[PDB]
Amino acid sequence: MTTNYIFVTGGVVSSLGKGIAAASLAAILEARGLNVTIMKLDPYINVDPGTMSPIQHGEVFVTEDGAETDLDLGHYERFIRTKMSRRNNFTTGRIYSDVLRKERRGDYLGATVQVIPHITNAIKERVLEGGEGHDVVLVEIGGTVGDIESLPFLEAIRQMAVEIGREHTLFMHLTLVPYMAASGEVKTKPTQHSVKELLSIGIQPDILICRSDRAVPANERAKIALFCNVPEKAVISLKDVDSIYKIPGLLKSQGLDDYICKRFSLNCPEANLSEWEQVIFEEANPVSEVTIGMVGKYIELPDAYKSVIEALKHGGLKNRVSVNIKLIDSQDVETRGVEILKGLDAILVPGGFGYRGVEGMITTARFARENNIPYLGICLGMQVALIDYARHVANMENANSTEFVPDCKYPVVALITEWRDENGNVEVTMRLGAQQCQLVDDSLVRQLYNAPTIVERHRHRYEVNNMLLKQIEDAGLRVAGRSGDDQLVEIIEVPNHPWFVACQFHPEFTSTPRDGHPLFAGFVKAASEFQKRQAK
Amino acid sequence: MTTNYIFVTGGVVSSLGKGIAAASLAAILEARGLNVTIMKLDPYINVDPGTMSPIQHGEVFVTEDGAETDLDLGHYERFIRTKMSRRNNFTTGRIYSDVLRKERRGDYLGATVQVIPHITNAIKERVLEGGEGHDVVLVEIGGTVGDIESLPFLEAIRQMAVEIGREHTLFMHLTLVPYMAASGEVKTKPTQHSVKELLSIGIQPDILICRSDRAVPANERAKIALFCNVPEKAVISLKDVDSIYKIPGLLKSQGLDDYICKRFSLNCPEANLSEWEQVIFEEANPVSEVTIGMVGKYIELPDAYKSVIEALKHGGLKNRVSVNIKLIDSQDVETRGVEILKGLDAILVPGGFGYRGVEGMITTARFARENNIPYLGICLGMQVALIDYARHVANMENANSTEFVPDCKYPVVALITEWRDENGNVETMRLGAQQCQLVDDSLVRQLYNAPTIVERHRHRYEVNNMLLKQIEDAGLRVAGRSGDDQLVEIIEVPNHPWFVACQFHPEFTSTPRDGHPLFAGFVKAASEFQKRQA
Amino acid sequence: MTTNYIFVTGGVVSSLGKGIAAASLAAILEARGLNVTIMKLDPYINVDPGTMSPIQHGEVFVTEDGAETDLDLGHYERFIRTKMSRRNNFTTGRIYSDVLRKERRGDYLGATVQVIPHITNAIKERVLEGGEGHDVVLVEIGGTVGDIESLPFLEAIRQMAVEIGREHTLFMHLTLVPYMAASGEVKTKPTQHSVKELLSIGIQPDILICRSDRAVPANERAKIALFCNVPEKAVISLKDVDSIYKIPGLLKSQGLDDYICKRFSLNCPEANLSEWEQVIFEEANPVSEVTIGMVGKYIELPDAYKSVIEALKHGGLKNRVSVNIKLIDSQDVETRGVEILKGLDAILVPGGFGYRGVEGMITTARFARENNIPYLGICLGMQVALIDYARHVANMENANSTEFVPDCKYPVVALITEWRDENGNVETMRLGAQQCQLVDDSLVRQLYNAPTIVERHRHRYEVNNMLLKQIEDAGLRVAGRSGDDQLVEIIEVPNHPWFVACQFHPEFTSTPRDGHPLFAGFVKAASEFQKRQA
Ligand SMILES: [Mg+2]
Ligand SMILES: [Mg+2]
Ligand SMILES: [Mg+2]
Ligand SMILES: [Mg+2]
Ligand SMILES: [Mg+2]
Ligand SMILES: [Mg+2]
C-alpha cells in the first residue's frame, strides 16, 4: 500500500470551497473502499487555532484527541469516516516553532538554518507523518497560490512530488472562473494566470477544479486544458450548488475519481454514492418546517458556529423537518427585551467566552424554560441555564460563574479550584477532547442516546460547582449525565418542560449528515412538536 | 499647455468596460472646460481594423477622416466632443509594419532593430502625436495586463512616464473585484495579483478602478489602498450600473477628477454634469414604448451594431419613448417569411456586406413599405430598398446589385464602373465624412433642417444612375446626393408614413446628448404608428 | 526517424559562447553517426541579416543556397558536415513580416492576429521545416532568457516540447557561473535566478551548461543540480578553453551525448573524436611561425572577419605553422604608408564594401606584388589588385571600380551593365555557391587539383571584360572564370612567389578538419618566405 498524495491548492480567490471539495473527493474515494485521509496546512504564524478569534477564524474545531483546530477538520469528519487527530492540521508557526527549538538545542549543528531545507524538511516530516498508512492522502494547502505565506508549503509539496514521483502524487488546483454580465461570458484568464504561478515555482497542476456561477462549458474547459494549464480531460467544473451533499456526485459525474484511480493505479470498485443520495433526498423532501433561534454573542461570523448549524440541519434531516435557523444576539435580548425570541419553535444557546452577551443568554434560557419552549444549550449555554434556575428557581440570589463575577455569593459555575460555598466554604483545568460520560437512568438523554455511556468532545474550564449542586437539584433541576473522577456534571435537564437539555460538551462535533446526532434529532423533533401544538 | 497623460490599463479579466470608463472620465474633465482627447492602443497584429470580423470585433467605427477603427472610438465620441482621427487608434501590427518598412529603407543604418527601443520608440511617437496639445490625453491600453500581447505598449508608456515625470503622468488601472455569494464577501486578491503584474513590469499604478457587481466598500478599499497596492484615495469603486450615462456622475462623486486635476495641477471649475443628468432623467422617464425590429445578418454578436443600437436608444431619449429593439435575422425572413415582421412599430435595416440574408432584407423593405411600417435603411439597408422599390414597382425583373449578381440586366446597385444598363448599355471606396445635399422638398430636408449635411461613409456599391430615372419615374424620391457625380445618398417613399434610406452611417454621429435627426424622426414615427395601430 | 529536438538557450549574460557549444555538441552526435542539424533563431526585427553592420553583427555568413546569415552558421559549418540553408537561420522580423503579409492576403479571415498563436505558430512551422528528417536538431535561441525580445521563440519551443513530449525534446540552457576572487568561490545564484526565469515562462531545463573561467566543481554542481535547478547529472561544466577544438571532447568526457542519446533512445556507437584529436594535436605542435598581415577597413570588430581568421588558422594547422595575424587598417597605409607593411611574411586583403580604405588596399596589393610578398585577396581584395595591376603595369591612369569612381575612363571593376571602356565604348548580385572553372596552367589549378571548383559568392562589381585583355597583355593571369558570361573569378601574378586573388569567399568553405587549398597554399608560402627572408 504505497501511500498516494493529492495536494489541494486554490488559486485566484480564497473562499473557493476547497475544504469542502477535498472533503467531497475524499468521500467518493472512501465510497470506493479506499483508506483515505485529509490534512490541513494553515499558512499562519499562530501556533494553534485554539487562540484564533471566532470572528475572523470561525469556530475552533476540536478533535477526539483534544487538538484545537481549523474548522475544515469539521468538514473532513462530516464527509469521511476517518477520525481527525492533531496530525491532521498544522500551521506555518508551529513549524517555525519547531525548527526554532531543534535549533536552539543543537540539532542543526552550528549549520545555518534556512527556509530550505530546514523549514521545508519540517513540513514534509509532518505531511508524511499524517499520511502514514493510508491509501490516499489529501493535502489541503491553505491560503492562495500566490501569497508568500504559502511559499514554504508549496515548495515542500513540490519536493515531495519529485521525490515520490508522478505515480503517487497529484496536484489538484482550484480556480475562480467569473461569469461576466458585461462579457455575458466565461473568463478563463484568471485560471491561466493562476496556473502560471504554479509553474513559476515548480508546480504543474495535474487537475483543475473550475469554480463558477454555473457549470463551465466544455468549450471553456477545453480552452483551459490546453490554454496554458496543459491538463488533459482533468479539467473539472464545480458549479455553485444548493447543497454540499451533491458535490461528491457532481465530481463523480465528471470522472474525477476515475482519473485519480488510474493515475494512482488503483484498481477499485465504482463509487456507490447511496448514502449521499439518501441525504440529498431526505433534505429535498421535508415534511414540516420549524424555526429555531440560535442565541449567542458571535453572530457577525456565522462560521463561528459552523458545526452547530450543520448539526441543526442534520437533526432536520433525521426528522424530515426543514429547519429555519434564526441567528440572535445574546445582547439585544438583554437590551431589546424578549420580543426578539418570540416566534421560535425552539432555542439554542451555543458556546463562547467572556461575560459579554451572557446576561441576555441567561434571559433566553429563562424565557425558554418559562415558556415551555424547547431549549438546547451547549457549554456556555448550559451554564447560562444552570444559572437562571439557580437564580429564578432557587435561592442562588445573584447566581453566576466566576468567569464573569469572580466574587459572587453564588458561584454555581466556576473552576474546580475555585469551588466555594455561599458562605465561602470549601473542599477537602482545560477539558479538551473526547471524553466518556455516564448517563443518568431515567433521563431524557439516556433515552435519546439509548446507551448508559457516551463519548463526547470537550473544550472548557469552568465546571458546575458541586458545592452548590444539591441546592439547585432540590429546586427541581436534574442531573442527566456525569463524568466520573470528580463526578463532574455534564448534562442537566429541567423536569417539567417539553424538551429541555443542556450539556457541557459539544455534541455538534459528532454530528454528521449521514448519521445525525441523537441530541439534535431530539431537539428538532421537539421543535416540530412544539410547532404542531402551537397552532393545533 | 504641458500635455498630461492618463494611462488606462486593465487587469484580471478583459471586458471590464475600460473603454466606457475612460470615456466617462474624459466626459468629466471636458465638463470642467478641459481640452481632452482619448486614444485606443490595440495589441493585435492586424494592421487595419477594417479587416476584422464583427464576430470577433464587433462594428467597424468610422472616423471623420475615413479611418476605420475599433468600436471604442464610437464610445469616445459619444462622451466627449473632441473628434477622433486615424491617429486615435493603432495596433501592434501597424507598429511593426512601420518599423519593418523603415528598416527596409535603411533608416536604421545596419543597426540591430529591436523591440526596445525601436518598437517602443515607435509607440511613444504615436502617443505624443495623438496627445499633441491637449490638456489631458487618455491613453487606453487594450488587452489584459500580464499578457504577452501588450508588453510593448506597457514598456513604452513606462518610459513616457519616466521621461515625462509624475507631474503630467498618471496610471489608471481597472480591475475585477469579485463577489463571493458564499462568504458574502468581496475578493481583493485578484487586484493585488494584478497590481503586482504591473510592478513586475516596472509600473506602479496611481489609481484603481474597482469593478464589482456592487459598490466596493471603503473597507475592502482601504485594504486595497494599501495592502498590496500602494495608491492613496485613488481607489475608486465602479459598480455595475444600469445606464452608462450614470458613470461620469458616479466617478465624479468619488472625486476622481479632483484627484486628477490636483495631480496635474489643473485649476478648473467643477464638472458641470447637467447634460448627463438630463439624459439620465429622460432615459428613466419614458412616456411610451415601442418595438423596432432590427433586421440583419450579423445579428448574432450585438457589438456588431453597437452604434446603431446606441442611436436608436438616443432616438428614444429625444422622444421620451422606450425603444424595444427586436434583433431579427434576415435569413429567417427568407426562411419563415414576413410572419416574423409581425409586431413591429418600425423596421430598421442596417448596413453590412455579404449576399447572405440580402434577400431576407429586400423582403423586409417591401413588407415595411407595403404595410406602411416606418422604415429606416442604412447603406445596405438602402440598397436592399432600391431593389424592392425598383422591382415590385418599376417592374424591373430581379433588380439587383452587382455585388451579389454581377449578371443582372437590372443592376441598380454597383460600382460606378460596372455601371451599365438593361440593354448592357454604358456611359474606389467611400470612407469618412462627406457633404451631402438635401433635396428641397424632402422629409429628410425638414428633419435636418438644412440644405447640406455631413455624414460618414463606408461603402463601394452605388445607385446606378443609369437606372435612377426609371425608379424615380416609378414614384421613388431622391432625397439627397453626394454632389459631383451627384451620387444618390438618400431616397424616400412618398406614400409612406415614414420611409427613409441613406448611404452614409447616420449612427456614427448620434450622441446621447444631441441625438440624431434621422433616428429622432424615425423613433417618433414608430411611436405614432404604435398608437394609431390600435 | 522521429525527429529529436534540443532547444539551446542562454541565461545571465550574452556571449557565453552558445553557438560554439551547440556546434560542439552537434559535432559529438555526428561523430556517433547521427544525422544532425542546427538552426539559429535570432530575436531581432531585421528581416535579413544581410543588411546589418559588422560593427554590430560581425561577418555576414553566406550559405550554399545564397542565404545571408548570422555568423553562427559559420560555426555550425566548421563543426558538422551538414550543410546550412536559408532555413537554418531566421529572425523575429522575418516572422512578423511573414504574418503581416499572410494577414494582408486574408489568410486569417478577419480573425484577430496575435502573438499567440499566429506568431508562435509561424515559428513552430519554421522549426519543423528545418529539422525535417534528421535524428537530432539543435535549435539555438538567440538572445538572453529574461528579455522581452526572445519571448515568442521561448513560447513556441515550449509548445513544441509540450506537443512533442519529453521523449524527443530536451532543453539545454547555458549560464554564467562567476568566480569570486574574494571568497575564492563560485557563484551559482545567477544560474538559479536564470533557471527561475525559464520557469516563470513555463520551461524547465533538462541540462545545464555551466560556463566559468575554470571548471565548475562537483560540489557547486550537485548544488545546482538540485537546489534551485532540478536537473539530473545534466549539470555540465564548460570552462574557458584555449581551443574550441577541445570542446567536443570536454563535453564528451562529461557524458553529455550519452545523456542525450539515452533520453532520445538513440542506440549508437561511441563518439569517434579522432579528427578533433588530430586538430588539437596539430594546433599545439606548430613547427614554425609566421606573421600574416590582414589589411582592411572593418578591422575594428574582429568578428567582422570571423571566417577569414578561422581559415588562416586552419592554414596553419595544415602546415604546422603558427599563424600570427596582424590586423592592419588600410587607412593607415593611406595615412602612414607601406611603412606598416614592414614585417609580414604574407598579406591578406579581405572583402568588404565602402570606398573607405580602398586606396590603402590597392597600395598594399602593389606593395605585396612589388616586394614579392605572398598575397591573397578575397573579393574586394581581388578587385583592389586588378586595379594596382592594371594601373602600375598596364599603365591605365587611375584604373578603378565604378563602385567608387563611376566616372573613370579606366574602370576594370563594375557591373556588367556599366561595362564601358576608356573610349566610353560599350557592348543583379552574386550570392551562394557557384561553379567556377580553373584555368589549366594555373597555380590555383594545382592547389585545388581540379578542373572545376565550387565557391561562395557575395558581390556585385565585376571584372570589366572590355578591359581584361589589356591587363592580360600587361602580364596578368586569369586563373578562373564563372562560365557563361565567363566572368573572371581568379587572377594570378606570374613573377610572384605566391599571388592569388579570387572573387568568391574561400573562407566560407574552410574547415579545421579539412582545411582549404587556397589558405593552405597561402600559409605554406608565408612560411617559405619567412625562412628565405633570413
Ligand atoms: Mg479550506
Ligand atoms: Mg488557512
Ligand atoms: Mg476597451
Ligand atoms: Mg484591443
Ligand atoms: Mg550564438
Ligand atoms: Mg541572435
From Swiss-Prot, chain A:
It comes from Escherichia coli (strain K12). Allosterically activated by GTP, when glutamine is the substrate; GTP has no effect on the reaction when ammonia is the substrate. The allosteric effector GTP functions by stabilizing the protein conformation that binds the tetrahedral intermediate(s) formed during glutamine hydrolysis. Also activated by magnesium; the enzyme requires more Mg(2+) for full catalytic activity than required simply to complex the nucleotide substrates. Inhibited by the product CTP, via allosteric rather than competitive inhibition. Also inhibited by divalent metal ions such as copper and zinc. CTP binds at residues 14, 147-149, 187-192, 223. InterPro entries: Class_I_gatase-like (IPR029062), CTP_synthase (IPR004468), CTP_synthase_N (IPR017456), GATASE (IPR017926), GATase1_CTP_Synthase (IPR033828), P-loop_NTPase (IPR027417). Optimum pH is 8.7. One of its GO terms (cellular component) is protein-containing complex. Catalyzes the ATP-dependent amination of UTP to CTP with either L-glutamine or ammonia as the source of nitrogen. Regulates intracellular CTP levels through interactions with the four ribonucleotide triphosphates. It is an enzyme of class 6 (ligase). This is CTP synthase. L-glutamine binds at residues 352, 380-383, 403, 461. Its EC number is 6.3.4.2. ATP binds at residues 15-20, 72, 239-241. GO terms for molecular function: ATP binding; CTP synthase activity; glutaminase activity; identical protein binding; magnesium ion binding. Pfam families: CTP_synth_N, GATase. CTPSs have evolved a hybrid strategy for distinguishing between UTP and CTP. The overlapping regions of the product feedback inhibitory and substrate sites recognize a common feature in both compounds, the triphosphate moiety. To differentiate isosteric substrate and product pyrimidine rings, an additional pocket far from the expected kinase/ligase catalytic site, specifically recognizes the cytosine and ribose portions of the product inhibitor. Homodimer that associates to form homotetramer in the presence of ATP and UTP. The substrate nucleotides ATP and UTP act synergistically to promote oligomerization of CTPS from inactive dimers to active tetramers. It comes from the Bacteria. Keywords: ATP-binding, Cytoplasm, Glutamine amidotransferase, Ligase, Magnesium, Metal-binding, Nucleotide-binding, Pyrimidine biosynthesis. Mg(2+) binds at residues 72, 140. The gene is pyrG. Belongs to the CTP synthase family. One of its GO terms (biological process) is protein homotetramerization. The keyword Ligase applies. Residues 291-533 form the Glutamine amidotransferase type-1 domain. Residues 2-266 are annotated as: Amidoligase domain. UTP binds at residues 14, 187-192, 223. Sequence consists of two domains: the C-terminal glutamine amide transfer (GAT) domain catalyzes the hydrolysis of glutamine; the N-terminal synthase domain catalyzes the amination of UTP. Pathway: Pyrimidine metabolism; CTP biosynthesis via de novo pathway; CTP from UDP: step 2/2.
Curated annotation (Swiss-Prot), chains B, C:
GO terms for cellular component: cytoophidium; cytosol; protein-containing complex. ATP binds at residues 15-20, 72, 239-241. Its EC number is 6.3.4.2. The keyword Protein biosynthesis does not apply. Pathway: Pyrimidine metabolism; CTP biosynthesis via de novo pathway; CTP from UDP: step 2/2. L-glutamine binds at residues 352, 380-383, 403, 460. It comes from Escherichia coli (strain K12). Mg(2+) binds at residues 72, 140. This is CTP synthase.
